[PDB]
């Protein structure tokens, strides 16, 4: 629950954000090296807005209990009893985006549909906590084992007003625009329905095995093209025309049709993660 700074042995780095970083550590009080591996998030060179949002993240994660969401283990009040480090579980198999590219050969559609379903269940639970993840993408999905994946990176995650179902972000997005829904791009509006849009994209990522040559980045930039209008503005224009990501190579038709529903123009017309769950689970049987 409470992690002594001196017993967190640093090993190496897992990610370096713009205002923060995630370090792989071993919490080893006993010295014999049997202590558990943990991911530890902390801030660097950050202003007041980030420190405050970082404190929201810790509470949101502390409060999420699901097999399909990465585990909060504790916090550490750090060197000089001043700073703040967020301690989480370490999953050694790594992120899904990298895992699919490496082990592509030993993984068939069934296994891909298992992942999708676990993620969908995870996202259904986040809905139930009135929580919008806001950064759902293969790079933030972790692999617990070859048959278990988890959702991670709650940095952009936000709870809804208790009386409303949507939320507006005052400062616009910085994370890749290719997972963002149109109302998010045009108006910085976010919701469970917006997360449903992004889940369409992770299905695409999944069934393209995160192959870089047909990534959302890769595909949209080929459709947007270069012409000066900003890249955010022309993607939106592309999306309002009704243009979407194309059917992946060898994609099961009925999976591509579920994406299309995730990507409906109006948020009210996208299926809930509750509607999607069974639809994924009993696609073939």
Ligand X SMILES: NC(=O)c1cnc2[nH]ccc2c1N[C@@H]1[C@@H]2C[C@@H]3C[C@H]1C[C@@](O)(C3)C2
Q: Which stretch binds ligand X (CB under 6 A): 136-144, 160-168, 225-233, 246-254?
A: 136-144
Q: Of all helices (H) and strands (E), which one includes residue 193? A: helix 192-207
Residue closer to ligand X, measured from CB, 99 or 263: 99
Instruction: Give the angle 277-91-99 at the CA atoms, nearest 5°.
Output: 70
Our finding on whether 95 is near ligand X (CB under 6 A) is: yes
- In sequence order, the β-bridge partners of residue 74 are 87
In the set 28, 67, 135, 211, the catalytic residue is: 135
Please say if 195 is a catalytic residue.
no
Our finding on whether 191 is near ligand X (CB under 6 A) is: no
CA distances from 65 to 57, 75, 120, 130, 185 (A): 14, 17, 15, 14, 31
The candidate with the shortest Cα–Cα distance to 138, out of 99, 80, 184, is 99
Q: Which of residues 24-63 bind a copy of itself (CB under 8 A)?
A: 48-49, 52-53, 55-56, 58-60, 63
Q: Which stretch binds ligand X (CB under 6 A): 48-56, 91-99, 125-133, 241-249?
A: 91-99
Distance CA 12, CA 148 (A): 24
Rounded least distance, CB 72 to a copy of itself, Å: 12
Q: Which stretch binds ligand X (CB under 6 A): 134-142, 214-222, 247-255, 273-281?
A: 134-142
Judged by the rule CB under 6 A, the positions of this chain that interact with ligand X are 14-15, 22, 39, 70, 88-91, 94-95, 139-140, 142, 152-153
Judged by the rule CB under 8 A, the positions of this chain that interact with a copy of itself are 48-49, 52-53, 55-56, 58-60, 63, 113-114, 117, 124, 127-130, 147-148, 159, 161-163, 272, 274-275, 277-279, 281-282
- Which residues belong to the annotated binding site for ATP? 14-22, 41
């Amino acid at each position: 629950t409470i992690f002594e700074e001196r017993h967190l042995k640093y090993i190496s780095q897992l990610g370096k954000g713009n205002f923060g970083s995630v370090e792989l550590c071993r919490y080893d009080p006993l010295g014999d090296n049997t202590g558990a591996l943990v991911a530890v998030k902390q801030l660097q060179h950050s202003g007041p807005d980030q420190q405050r949002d970082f404190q929201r993240e810790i509470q949101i994660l502390k409060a999420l209990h699901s097999d399909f969401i990465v585990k909060y283990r504790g916090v550490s009040y750090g060197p000089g009893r001043q700073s703040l480090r967020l301690v989480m579980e370490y999953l050694p198999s790594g992120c899904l985006r990298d895992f699919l590219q490496r082990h592509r050969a030993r993984l068939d559609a069934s296994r891909l549909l298992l992942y999708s379903s676990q993620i969908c269940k995870g996202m259904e639970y986040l809905g139930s906590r009135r929580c919008v993840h806001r950064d759902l993408a293969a790079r933030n999905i972790l692999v617990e084992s070859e048959a278990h994946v988890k959702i991670a990176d709650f940095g952009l995650a936000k709870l809804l007003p208790l009386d409303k179902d949507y939320y507006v972000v005052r400062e616009p997005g910085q994370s890749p625009i290719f997972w963002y829904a149109p109302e998010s791009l045009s108006d910085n509006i976010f919701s469970r329905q917006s997360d449903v849009w992004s889940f369409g994209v992770v299905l695409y990522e999944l069934f393209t095995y995160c192959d870089k040559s047909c990534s959302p980045s890769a595909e949209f930039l080929r459709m947007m093209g270069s012409e000066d209008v900003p890249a955010l503005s022309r993607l939106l224009e592309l999306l309002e025309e009704g243009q979407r990501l194309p059917a992946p190579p060898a994609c099961p038709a009925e999976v591509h049709e579920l994406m299309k529903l995730c990507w409906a123009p109006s948020p009210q017309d996208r299926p809930s993660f509750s509607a999607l769950g069974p639809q994924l689970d009993m696609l073939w049987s």
